[PDB]
Amino acid sequence: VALFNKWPLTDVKCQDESLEAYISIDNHSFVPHSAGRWSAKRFRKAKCPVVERLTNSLMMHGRNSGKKLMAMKTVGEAFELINLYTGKNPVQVLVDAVANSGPREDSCRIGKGVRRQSVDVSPLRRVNIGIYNIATGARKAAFRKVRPFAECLAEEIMNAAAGADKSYAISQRNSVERIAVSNR
């Protein structure tokens, strides 16, 4: 299977053994349009191509609700712009970006009378927040700029994968985690 008729899933293995189970490349299908019901069942969401989850996160804000065909086109162009600069498999750079963008600690009240305490983010939530943060940083970046959505999405993934704080998603992870360390 070559996603966008160009990229295999053979070398795409997640190094993070805590997050590897919830990221799946086995179900990948050229063109991330599988109409499989992810809403059904508590953890069927986990068994979904990571690239399709990104294609579902991309279509937000209402003015762009439901247009998967346009989102997956962006994912292909973004992957080409990641291949063009990183010079690595872009499905594998996304896998590293999802792994890093996910914070491991959050703040919730915990049966307190507004006093939040430290909690541990679940390994599914880490994957869901990570992808959501990648797409929302790009969304905000391309709102009023000549820079296309594809270019900013390509750059957040490239920045997250290393861990550069320029990524809106990694800044969010460090803010969430730090509030969790103090509310500990």
């Binding site: 050229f30 349009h33 109409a35 499989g36 065909l69």
Partner: protein, 151 residues
């Protein structure tokens, strides 16, 4: 467009061994399979050239998993009506899978071929049950409701 009796109306006879029906989101495809050279035609048009250029791989997906050699030797005439473009691309992959499987029929090879498709993609050979829900009074949406001004 709505489940009309227009199977033979497009093509007269032609020894179409099977007449499968694949239906996704109010779109039905009647696919007619006969011995051929591996040609597949949809709506009197080459299957490779389909309207959602991005989803043109989804149409050819059953051929890839099953194998080109098994597909070779078949000619399929598919007529899709109802529904919309993406469902019509989902209906034709379902129709192609069901029809090619019909040639094996009750064979052990069919059970393997149904399992082979069901593993790569389940519901490729099984209809998707989801259908549109009705609008209810007091809401523009089927379940959405009007904003409450007070309270």
């Amino acid at each position: 467009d709505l489940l009309e009796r227009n199977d033979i109306e497009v093509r007269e006879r032609d020894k179409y061994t099977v007449h499968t029906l694949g239906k996704k989101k109010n779109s039905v495809a009647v696919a007619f399979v006969k011995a051929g050279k591996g040609d597949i035609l949809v709506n009197n048009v080459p299957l490779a050239l389909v309207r959602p250029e991005i989803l043109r791989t989804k149409v050819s997906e059953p051929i890839m998993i099953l194998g080109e050699s098994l597909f070779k030797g078949l000619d399929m005439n598919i007529k899709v009506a109802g529904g919309g473009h993406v469902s019509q691309i989902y209906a034709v992959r379902q129709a192609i899978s069901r029809g090619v499987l019909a040639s094996v029929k009750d064979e052990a090879a069919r059970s393997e071929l149904r399992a082979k498709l069901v593993s790569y993609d389940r519901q490729l050979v099984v209809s998707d049950p989801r259908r549109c829900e009705a609008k209810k009074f007091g809401g523009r949406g089927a379940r959405a409701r009007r904003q409450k001004s007070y309270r």
